[PDB]
Design a protein around this ligand. Structure first.
Ligand SMILES: Cc1cc2nc3c(=O)[nH]c(=O)nc-3n(C[C@H](O)[C@H](O)[C@H](O)COP(=O)(O)O)c2cc1C
Ligand SMILES: Cc1cc2nc3c(=O)[nH]c(=O)nc-3n(C[C@H](O)[C@H](O)[C@H](O)COP(=O)(O)O)c2cc1C
Ligand SMILES: Cc1cc2nc3c(=O)[nH]c(=O)nc-3n(C[C@H](O)[C@H](O)[C@H](O)COP(=O)(O)O)c2cc1C
Ligand SMILES: Cc1cc2nc3c(=O)[nH]c(=O)nc-3n(C[C@H](O)[C@H](O)[C@H](O)COP(=O)(O)O)c2cc1C
Lengths: 407, 409, 407, 409
């Protein structure tokens, strides 16, 4: 015995791993690590839900074996073929001598392409298939493009458990298995960060999945990342997804994202920020030299209005701002939102036009003022006052936006 | 005068005129992952008064905020609680701008301000713990808190408005547009409040006991700190309660933290087995590996652990440099003094890291090093070794629970 | 005495500062720090050439004072108004009680806007003005947009010194003042990095400035960054600028720039790399998770061909690759060069089309194969062979490009 | 079989089948700013032979390169010089793929390979310094180099082709498509060759003396290393000459390095004055501040300095944790043993960092701590203090020059 068995509810065990050390994960800055949660269901047909990424294969296998001999597992349910939940299967899928791998057709296709699994036995399920595992039954809820074509939730009607896989997840390494055992506001913070960064462009798919969830009874949501959900905290998590899925998740908040070389665009950004704050909005300033794209997604996600700024560098915007806009564009996080642009230049104003074009045509933001504010080389008190006034207007627009899109 | 700052009246006649340091990430070696702020306050009274200054890069912003409230030549008093650069260094170049002001501080603070910053032509008013400064409707009192955390450290108290200007006290390195804890997630503010305590104040519990004793003697409705958000109502009660428990050594949790570094991951795998053992007792368990952590987080977690473990493979006849740094830091801050502490690690040919860690835990940190052998092994772990690690963790977890029971609030 | 006087040639003293600690400088990764070199000319009219960035004002003033009382300086020549050479003047320009600030009209304009300097005495020079300073005279060579509109070189005909300011510079912190006292190949390395990152888009302006330099005699080039140049090493530095200015600076070299989340685009990149290597080219692989835009500029600068790769992330390329392309585009470093693109996708191939468009229309590279190589989810031996073959073709194209554009 | 690797014949019948690790940036705590490679070699002879393996993540690439030269079932010998994971860990999962191979190594290497990696069904041939392995036209000899840098470390020598397969020996953490030093900037390769020596081998000069003695007895035309580029001709002469000087303690330069950390920059400014003093003597001077440097660079520079200084302000009654790490690392590597060493630093109320640095330099590093007082000051420097620092630097520079003269090659 060198693992602790962790029964979370009667007959359902956490057999995942905590990734204490991960700091960059597919470009997400996981400042608090993550976990790859897998579950063991102690029933007539002993069942494993999901796997883990491949450096942790032996730890995963050890926790399963502590519950049930690997050769007595009957079913391994795979919700999603992504490596963080999957990749252990490439070299380890055989240790489940007598198991059937249970998944949808699209999941089975991706698993084979990724990891091979040439000798595996399959059971291909769908949204009408009911799988008897003894006392319990399992249903399968395809959630295509939430966030992959193969994404699935597994639902146990008897215990009222949703195995939501990436759904309801947070990149959060902890020894606690439930949200309510932590600071719930901290878990909700990471839950929103996960939503912004991974799910941002899939609000429509979320509406569909929440609609399905609303037709069944759920007392527990066991996610594949971070902590799991029950009772009141579970209510909060569901409500946040619900508002987000309807575009009702924004706050009276302005975020300014920028980079700067000699600090003048930064000083203007501070004056604009005070203007926005004067309207009663929360204001956040994110400078790419001290921030990252993961935080840009987090804050733009629930901002009522945004500003992006850069001085002109080599006839365009700074690369860090190009990265941030690419990321926000891909994730659709500012679509329809008031968006302002400003920046210094030395001889030819190019960054601001480029930012404006990207916000308007790329992000489909509400670029209400295409001129923005530009200045040659240095600010002055009058320019600071102009930035402040633009901030007042931006904060007013954020408040009006939130009212228009209110929950 | 063009308007480019928002006036921020926090309570009647008291304005925030500080700055938010959005970008700072390393601050005297503190990993300020969430930035900080240098809070300064303007009191609108018959003698217009400024409390504290800010770090020199932000001087013009600070002066701009003050001038929006009152012309600089009409400021009568600038009260300085602390001479450290983050609240003071703008005075070097800029103090002359307060044409008519007198700088008000204790003798120790004046000595330090002059050595650091010059202020050769400044007008001073030297105060002590018996001085009442009249500023109009309000008066101000001064509470020296020496070595909380500098010899010059002071609090300023206003009896009429029940305000404690606590300077570094009650601070958190937290950049936000919010001025009050209750406007934020209070649990998040408390997390950073604890990180600040662990990293800046850790060795000063006796001085905190003294300071809390004095504060207990007067009514406080507001604590306006010089870093991060300020305190009122219920949230203020929480902040005070944490300092009180910590000053008495009653701040610990049923929690085990393992701090380590590893080169090929075998010391890491043994750490995981130990952690599960500890978790089985009902303790929270945190693993901090120095390649993905930092000394600021080491201080945070060791602060409120009931027990700790430190681990390293042998590298060149000693422990890994990252673990030496973590131990230096923890020793200086006294965070694990008296606490159950365990050590383990791999070696190739000569076991040196674990003996060196044990000696440092026992003689440097003055931890409760109950097992001076620890667990060592050559090159690789086995299932038997993982089991031994797990069992050592169970015992460590039990010792953490015992330590907390003995020191309970 | 707490500074060492550093006479570099008779009557000419280094009075700059070494910035040992700087690691990020206007977005340039200065892994080896930098220096802001200023010079004191001991003549009848004691003269200072350039200033320094503003945290180092007192150290600069101290080294000058060690040579000559600050109130006995007659001239302060300013080549360039950028903060790294300038910004000390804002709060310190007055310490030169009896000095005249000598610069071109555009330099004077930028200095005032930046730093104020309201009480300063000016002498506005131009490309025909000769300034007597005693034994020596100074001439002024405007080098507009090398790299700023105000950029200037100062030339002393008697001593045959070119004070080239940013010209001939390298971000290199050392106690050595001359290239030949270091490892010259190391200095040339940083010299090329500086060229790629700061001067990349100004080859035309470099041809003009080298033409002017070719009309006068230069024994020493005293730069404002890093080490200075004489004799043989000086010949190397001049020759590299000359080739670069004519587009003759490329090597038989292929650089592949990419990011990857799960490593399949990375494995394909390795096979492509071996294909290019087989043709006799040097091959460099730069992965954005372990590289930076400064290194991307360095390597694309002298590559004969390039490849950019990314899997599809949220219907576009990864943000780090968007940043790299923005930067390379701004700097014009791959204009006209063979350029290939490839990458994995899960369901909709978008990164490769976006990379192709950016390379073709943005960078104006020679995108000879717009399809590139794309694959769903995972490589296979046949796909690796396809990547290898594309690499052979890319390396052949790099060699043909170098031959076409040969020195 | 699809073709997706280039065969890379380095010399007649000897092929590079290693991997270039383009992305590695931290390697067992070494800051590998330029990546590395794990070089393995295939010898085309009557008994097809592989020298060394690679780190497990790169196993399939390594096997692909080998298979392009020879089917895996036709490999007769796999020679293992060293059991460390970077050259060996692919064997854990993959060793069975060499169906017909015998693993050839010393007894110590076999013991370590089995403990690390299992290899339960492997066929072994245990060799020693008197064994000649016939592989066809060629024979192979084995040169144990214990503690250069592991107990199992070995070189393999081919007498017919005059090849030394030196494994970690002569290595550099350098990722490049070039296989030979002379195809690169040789000065750059030598820089990294020195960084490798300083960081990996620093404490093993005696073992290097032994190894060079043995190598001197045979003719070597090629040194094929397991990291970075390999050596031939003139460049090979340079590499050998550096190891020779270093093994004899003759590797130092007229060079002073100052290693420090600072919180508010006054210790930093004094460092600059000291550095100018040192520079005035004709020494090169390098300043390394831990917030912008790393222990790998500290090792690099202290390696070939004739004198050093270490500095820190007092933080919580001791030196800054970053400086404790740098000293731990330097102590373990023995890089400043016998070298003139100076200490200085600011303090606020109680001078603790400088005494702690002096004790560590003197008793831990066994440096020549000629002035145990150093320079300390409260809070801030003055022109007089800068002058004192400058003078201490002049003296340190003179002592560096003297140390180099005494130890000259
Ligand atoms: C390396 C560098 C490149 C620049 N390239 C351009 C350019 O292409 N066009 C332009 O108008 N200004 C250019 N500038 C001028 C900047 O836009 C100008 O310095 C501005 O004031 C910087 O704003 P900031 O203080 O926010 O960094 C450049 C400046 C630097 C330092
Ligand atoms: C560069 C390096 C230096 C080492 N130095 C020592 C040493 O001085 N003494 C020792 O007993 N083992 C030494 N070792 C062996 C390690 O302690 C051994 O590899 C251990 O198993 C590593 O533990 P880990 O897997 O947790 O990294 C060294 C290993 C490396 C990689
Ligand atoms: C967070 C994430 C988002 C993705 N978004 C898309 C997408 O928008 N379109 C697509 O075709 N594939 C998408 N993919 C699939 C990747 O392109 C696919 O996993 C690919 O194989 C990764 O290549 P790599 O191994 O080089 O990282 C996404 C994958 C992840 C992990
Ligand atoms: C957080 C912190 C902790 C300190 N702890 C001590 C201490 O334990 N003893 C002491 O004498 N000075 C202490 N000091 C004072 C510093 O040593 C003093 O500020 C010194 O001038 C800093 O040097 P520097 O400018 O090189 O950073 C401390 C300062 C700070 C900022």
């Amino acid at each position: 015995k060198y693992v602790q068995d962790q029964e979370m509810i009667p007959g359902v065990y956490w057999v995942g791993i905590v990734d204490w050390m991960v700091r960059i994960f597919h470009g997400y800055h996981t400042d608090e690590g993550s976990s790859y949660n897998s579950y063991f269901i102690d029933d007539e047909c002993p069942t494993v839900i999901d796997s883990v990424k491949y450096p942790f294969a032996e730890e995963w296998l050890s926790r399963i074996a502590a519950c049930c001999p690997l050769d007595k597992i009957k079913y391994v349910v795979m919700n999603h073929a992504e490596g963080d939940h999957a990749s252990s299967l490439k070299d380890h899928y055989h240790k489940f001598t007598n198991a059937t791998f249970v998944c949808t057709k699209k999941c089975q296709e991706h698993l084979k392409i990724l990891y091979g699994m040439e000798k595996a036995t399959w059971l291909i399920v769908d949204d009408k298939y009911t799988l008897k595992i003894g006392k319990r039954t399992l249903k399968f809820i395809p959630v295509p493009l939430l966030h992959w074509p193969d994404s699935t939730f597994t639902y146990c009607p008897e215990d009222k458990i949703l195995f939501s896989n990436d759904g309801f997840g947070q990149h959060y390494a902890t020894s606690r298995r439930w949200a309510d055992e932590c600071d719930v506001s901290h878990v909700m913070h990471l839950f929103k960060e996960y939503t912004a960064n991974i799910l941002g462009l899939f609000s429509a798919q979320m509406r569909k999945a929440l609609e399905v969830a609303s037709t069944v009874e759920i007392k527990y949501i066991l996610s594949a990342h971070g902590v799991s959900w029950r009772g009141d905290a579970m209510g909060l998590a569901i409500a946040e997804y619900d508002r987000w899925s309807k575009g009702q998740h924004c706050q009276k908040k302005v975020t300014v994202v920028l980079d700067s070389m000699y600090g003048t665009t930064h000083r203007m950004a501070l004056a604009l920020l005070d203007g926005a704050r004067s309207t009663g909005c929360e204001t956040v300033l994110l400078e790419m030299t001290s921030s990252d794209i993961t935080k840009v997604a987090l804050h733009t996600y629930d901002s009522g209005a945004v500003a992006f700024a850069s001085p002109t560098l080599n006839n365009t915007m700074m690369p860090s701002v190009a990265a941030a806009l690419n990321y926000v564009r891909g994730l659709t996080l500012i679509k329809g939102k008031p968006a302002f642009a400003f920046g210094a230049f030395g001889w030819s104003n190019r960054a601001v036009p480029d930012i404006v074009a990207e916000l308007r045509d790329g992000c489909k933001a509400d670029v209400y003022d295409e001129k923005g504010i530009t200045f040659k080389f240095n600010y002055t008190e009058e320019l600071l006052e102009q930035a402040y006034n633009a901030g007042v207007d931006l904060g007013k627009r954020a408040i009006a936006y939130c009212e228009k899109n209110a929950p």
